[PDB]
Paper text:
CDT is a member of the Iota family of protein toxins which also consists of two homologous toxins produced by Clostridium perfringens (the Iota toxin) and Clostridium spiroforme (C. spiroforme Transferase, CST). All three Iota toxin family members are assembled from two polypeptide chains termed the “A” subunit (CDTa, Ia, and CSTa) and “B”, subunit (CDTb, Ib, and CSTb). All three B subunits are presumed to contain five domains that are involved in regulation (D1), oligomerization (D2 and D3), and host recognition (D3’ and D4). Once proteolyzed, the mature form of CDTb forms a large heptameric, soluble structure referred to as the prepore which binds one molecule of CDTa to generate the toxic moiety, CDT.
However, due to significantly lower particle counts for the larger oligomeric intermediates, a decrease in resolution was observed for all intermediate structures containing more than three protomers. The helical nature of the oligomeric intermediates is also observed in the model of the tetrameric intermediate which illustrates a separation of ~46 Å across the tetramer. When propagated about the asymmetric heptameric structure, this would account for a total separation of ~15 Å in the vertical dimension and ~58 Å in the horizontal direction forming a ‘lock-washer’ like structure and indicating the structural plasticity observed across the oligomerization interface is not restricted to two-dimensional space.
Numbering used by the authors:
A (entry chain C), B (entry chain D): 218 to 315, 319 to 451, 457 to 748
Write the structure that this text describes.
């Protein structure tokens, strides 16, 4: 009844109970939990509960732009777009006009690679820290170009460059937007960076863009030929970066400064998008929220949900856990003690968690006062960076098992597992996961949980590949998370062997395989 | 109960008790110091207690731009942005369009290098003056560039310049803000000066910037590529500076004028930044305040905090000492007798304090009337220039010990120290601090306090480097601040030794190692 801000949601409703139905506001009482309505909590001191240019009434009543993702309807979640550029095919011709020697390679853009390339894992995890620390944290703007169609052949051989000259470079690209907001007068600047050697800056203008870029699409819309770099001329190169690129290094591509407007609905008619900008509010959004990246094996999200300053009782903003933030940011189906995506079982024991040094130190500090020792029951403070990686394959010996192949001696008939049941061991356990399904010249992590209600009954693992290893593991009365690395190579090799030899007492649960980054092939 | 300004805070509350909670003002009764609420004090003759475009109500209540630092929520702390230019990579090419003979070198920018370059250090500090006098005081507008990748090789050999001609010069720059205020319509002028020969006046324009620069942010936001000078043409140089830059002089780069606006909350919607300027309150803030620079090893701050004219009985403005200004300007945690930043124990005996002639002589004058002989218990004066430099390493035989190398014959089981405990001396005292963790070819100072409850018992010290030195130090009943200079060299040398022989009576405390400025090299 009592109103604070210029939003129709009152002080008693801005916090502690939050529902909008048929363009009026009602409290939350768990009577319409599965009837398409969710509970929120907003700041009661700002109608713009997030850093958004929207009142929390404007953003949660449907009274806003329909191109905005409904994940931004939560008042704590801010509408925030991120545009990057995917790399498709690299063509190298020795002319400045556009004949001559020319090579062409198929390039794949990896977005979340540099964030996760400098990650090195131990065999075991100390304390309740069930995650690892990245060396550096990078957002979803940068892209790393991997050459796939690269047999043993030097790049110099296809161009025949002797002493000082070089060719010219041309590229195939995609212009993706990954955020909870739409984007209109897109003007991105972009650096073509080879380990700091920026070959050129290309700005995408507006003509080769079109005056709309909705979230979740490239400029070449889905299945289409990628846009070449001639529509605004050729990029030069010199013979220092050729053997640099040839041997181990890859070309990188980074969007530097992306400029444009947003749209606001007018009084009478259709939208107007002229007198706005996603430049005057970027820092306002980026300062109040933490930064959370979700990364499946085929797409990614990145969200900014407003958090709390702990050293500020004057700051009266809602406080949520990690899991509450993930549910109200990305959208999650709440099963009993579990969060789900549309299909992926997401948990602190089902995916891979990555934090930079500040976030890792903060959660290491916070885990100690927890009486439960879990990652997700930690309140969010303003301004941390969190990354979530879905593993490539995952089973929990439960409803979810998307494996390429099954094991040997699977005794899942159990109930003292982490999620219900668990897989018993009696003898060996075998998987022969093929060469062609896996991506060449990459790095992969096999992780699992082993529990043993015995004193010193132990297991041995063996990962047989081109870089094979044999390791010894001791489980105990508690559950043990273990991780072991291996490297992929090109597809003309044999299959991939993983063998586990136990002693019939150790129990295995929640086995996952994830990708980390690509090892550079020698060329 | 009496209102004087247009500030809702009354006459009885604009002085002697000052708290904003939930956009109302209450007196200070120290029932609420430890819940994140700081005590302040404002004018009652002017609405804007500082020279900022904010009243004391506007700036201390959250009723202002959220991009402004909360250290500027203190009404005595003025919103004052200082934008400097980081220098990253120096590339020399002999062409005009952008082939030819090129070199590329790694350069590092120091903000406070010229301010602390004229610092001459006494081994024995007279009076309570436990500090030094710099010859010159410079703000955070200038930068000095040191070239790192320097083997023995002249610049002229790599370009082969005989008589009159020369190449052109190209640069990598970043554009940081160091102040308690934001920045929008960035129009800076920056001179590229080589010992008086300004090689260019580079203007950043606005397109290569974007219309925002937050406090504490470069133009390439954190991890990116630095902005280059081809997006606005090449810069020339001539063959009088080629040997000059080669032999002794390094290029400096300083901002002269920066133009641009700030942002105000409108009546209806969002912030507006057209009808503002960071060129009119610059003189209002720079002239009413002292100029206080803080220099960590990894960033720098520069604040202008309003001071008092002591020759003015009608002027009723708040008055603070050095420490009160530091706390209210930077944000500090108060331990028992200690000011803390995030981790650094800051004091008048834990860091280096630097004053130009005006501030240093006024401090020496103020030292006589004080009965405590400490530096921080001096009232601030208008238009004073105070610089604080942290030591690179600092230990006090206490909770704070960040020395990577460790000492010998350390008996910290004592309590007659300056800060609690002290280290007893028996025989030799050794430290082998290696070449890897010290910055090559730069001037460093080993400083400490020696106290001796005996008549003439003394020590000998020895700082062994490429120049080794032995000194004789006599301590007495009081605490003695002593300092010894030394120079680092290239990493192909041996370790750095600091040794001292005592006589079993001398006591040592508060040992620090700081750095003053870089030295030119033979080339
Ligand atoms: Ca309200
Ligand atoms: Ca609100
Ligand atoms: Ca299970
Ligand atoms: Ca007033
Ligand atoms: Ca006032
Ligand atoms: Ca001490």
């Amino acid at each position: 009844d009592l109103d604070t801000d210029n939003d129709n949601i009152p002080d008693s409703y801005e916090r502690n109970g939050y529902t909008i139905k048929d363009l009026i506001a009602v409290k939350w009482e768990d009577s319409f939990a599965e009837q398409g309505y969710k509970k929120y909590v907003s700041n009661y001191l700002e109608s713009n509960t997030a850093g958004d240019p929207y009142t929390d009434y404007e953003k949660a009543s449907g009274s806003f732009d329909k191109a905005i993702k409904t994940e931004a309807r939560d008042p704590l979640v801010a509408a925030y777009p991120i545009v990057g550029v995917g790399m498709e095919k690299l063509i190298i011709s020795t002319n400045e006009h556009a004949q001559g020697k020319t090579v062409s390679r198929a390039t794949t853009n990896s977005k979340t690679e540099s964030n996760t390339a400098g990650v090195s894992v131990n065999v075991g995890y100390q304390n309740g820290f069930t995650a690892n620390v990245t060396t550096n944290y990078s957002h979803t703007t940068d892209n790393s170009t991997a050459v796939q169609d690269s047999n043993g052949e030097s790049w110099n051989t296809g161009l025949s460059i002797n002493k000082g000259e070089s060719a010219y470079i041309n590229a195939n690209v995609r212009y993706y937007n990954t955020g909870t907001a739409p984007m209109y007068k897109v003007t991105p600047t972009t650096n073509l960076v080879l380990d700091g050697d920026t070959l050129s800056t290309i700005k995408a203008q507006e003509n080769q863009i079109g005056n709309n870029l909705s979230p979740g699409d490239t400029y070449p819309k889905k299945g289409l030929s990628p846009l070449a770099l001639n529509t605004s001329r050729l990029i030069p190169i010199n013979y220092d970066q050729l053997k640099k690129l040839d041997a181990g290094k890859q070309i990188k591509l980074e969007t530097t400064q992306v400029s444009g407007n947003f749209g606001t609905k007018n009084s009478s008619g259709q939208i107007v998008t002229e007198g706005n900008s996603w430049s005057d509010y970027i820092s306002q959004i980026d300062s109040i929220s933490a930064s959370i990246i979700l990364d499946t094996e085929n797409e990614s999200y990145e969200r900014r949900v407003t958090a709390k300053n702990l050293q500020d009782p004057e700051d009266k903003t809602p406080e949520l856990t990690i899991g509450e933030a993930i549910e109200k940011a990305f959208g999650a189906t709440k099963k009993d003690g579990l969060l789900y995506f549309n299909d992926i079982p997401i948990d602190e024991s089902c995916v891979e968690l990555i934090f930079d040094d500040n976030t890792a130190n903060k959660i290491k500090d916070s885990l100690k006062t927890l009486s439960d020792k879990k990652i997700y029951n930690v309140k969010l403070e303003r301004g941390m960076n969190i990354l979530i990686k879905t593993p490539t394959y995952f089973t929990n010996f439960d409803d979810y098992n998307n494996y390429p192949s099954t094991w040997s001696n699977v005794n899942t008939t159990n109930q003292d597992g982490l999620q219900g049941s668990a897989n018993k061991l009696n003898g060996e356990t075998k998987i022969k996961i093929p060469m062609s399904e896996l991506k060449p010249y990459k790095r992969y992590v096999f992780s699992g949980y082993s529990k043993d209600p015995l004193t010193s009954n132990s297991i041995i693992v063996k990962i047989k590949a081109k870089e094979e290893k044999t390791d010894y593991l001791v489980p105990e009365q508690g559950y043990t998370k273990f991780s072991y690395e291996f490297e992929t190579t090109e597809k003309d090799s044999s299959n991939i062997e993983i063998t586990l030899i136990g002693s019939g007492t150790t129990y295995l649960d929640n086995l996952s395989i994830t990708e980390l980054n690509s090892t550079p092939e020698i060329l």
